[PDB]
Amino acid sequence: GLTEEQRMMIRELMDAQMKTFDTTFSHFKNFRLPGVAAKWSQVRKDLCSLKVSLQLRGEDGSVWNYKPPADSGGKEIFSLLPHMADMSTYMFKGIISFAKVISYFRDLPIEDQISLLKGAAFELCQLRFNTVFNAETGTWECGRLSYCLEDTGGFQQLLLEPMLKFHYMLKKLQLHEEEYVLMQAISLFSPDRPGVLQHRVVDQLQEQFAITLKSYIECNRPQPAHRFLFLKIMAMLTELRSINAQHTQRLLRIQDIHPFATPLMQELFGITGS
Ligand SMILES: ClC1=C(Cl)[C@]2(Cl)[C@@H]3[C@@H](Cl)[C@@H](Cl)C[C@@H]3[C@@]1(Cl)C2(Cl)Cl
């Protein structure tokens, strides 16, 4: 029951997703790995909230496993930062390529493209990561890389971290590929990001992506479990925006006392190099 324009709109987004999302992470390579005063207290809280072990499955059948150190009041809490910087950079590139393929994005002024990507790159990265999240094992399955949440409390204590609660709650909605990519579009075309000039154009595009999503759900999900699903998704996007703001401040705090951001991360977060 979608209109012609809505069916074309979903197809272009699905097309962009297919072309730019390396779902097996086969081209993520050359990444760094861990080696073989009230600020620090806050940075310690910042880093200790998302602790993961790492596994690497070699193409030959070998397996490397990394278990992170406990916080002992030292630099060891930074040991996974270079690797995560490389992974974030890889995802950011796919997100930039995603936006560039979309006609509605490419027709915006170049200054607004940059402002929208700076505002939504993290959110779109999280949305893509959720599609490889395994909620039963607490693992992001990134092809031959796996990131497994470290035990602690149990899961209920882990779900107090908002980013982890977001991933579990979003996964439980059991969304289709089309609903994920419409969420990426609504997030990308947010008219209220810092520096956006064509505010009215972006707002109208966002409204159309949300209408298409509302219509998609109504045409393809009649089950009582999916009542209010559209409103649940919009609430998740509002929460993802809040998480985006928390993560930025948390990144800038860590960067203030222990630099790690790659050049592309610096560009996206307003770090000038000076
Ligand atoms: Cl935190 C955090 C880590 Cl760690 C992972 Cl790998 C990923 C890194 Cl690359 C940044 Cl983009 C934030 C996400 C999450 Cl939420 C996951 Cl777990 Cl997907």
UniProtKB/Swiss-Prot annotation:
Superkingdom, natural source: Eukaryota
Keyword Coiled coil in annotation: no
Residue intervals of the NR LBD domain: 5-273
UniProt keyword annotations, A-Z: Activator, DNA-binding, Metal-binding, Nucleus, Receptor, Transcription, Transcription regulation, Zinc, Zinc-finger
Residues annotated to bind hyperforin: 88, 126-129, 247
Tissue expression summary: Expressed in liver, colon and small intestine.
GO cellular component: chromatin; intermediate filament cytoskeleton; nuclear body; nucleoplasm; nucleus; transcription regulator complex
Cellular localisation: Nucleus
GO MF annotations in UniProt: DNA-binding transcription activator activity, RNA polymerase II-specific; DNA-binding transcription factor activity, RNA polymerase II-specific; nuclear receptor activity; nuclear receptor binding; RNA polymerase II cis-regulatory region sequence-specific DNA binding; RNA polymerase II transcription regulatory region sequence-specific DNA binding; sequence-specific double-stranded DNA binding; zinc ion binding
UniProt-listed GO biological process terms: cell differentiation; cellular response to molecule of bacterial origin; intestinal epithelial structure maintenance; intracellular receptor signaling pathway; negative regulation of DNA-templated transcription; negative regulation of transcription by RNA polymerase II; positive regulation of DNA-templated transcription; positive regulation of gene expression
Family the UniProt entry places it in: Belongs to the nuclear hormone receptor family. NR1 subfamily.
Description of how the protein assembles with itself and partners: Heterodimer with RXR. Interacts with NCOA1. Interacts (via domain NR LBD) with CRY1 and CRY2 in a ligand-dependent manner.
Name recorded for this polypeptide: Nuclear receptor subfamily 1 group I member 2
Taxonomic source organism: Homo sapiens (Human)
Gene: NR1I2
Span within the parent record: 142 to 434 of 434
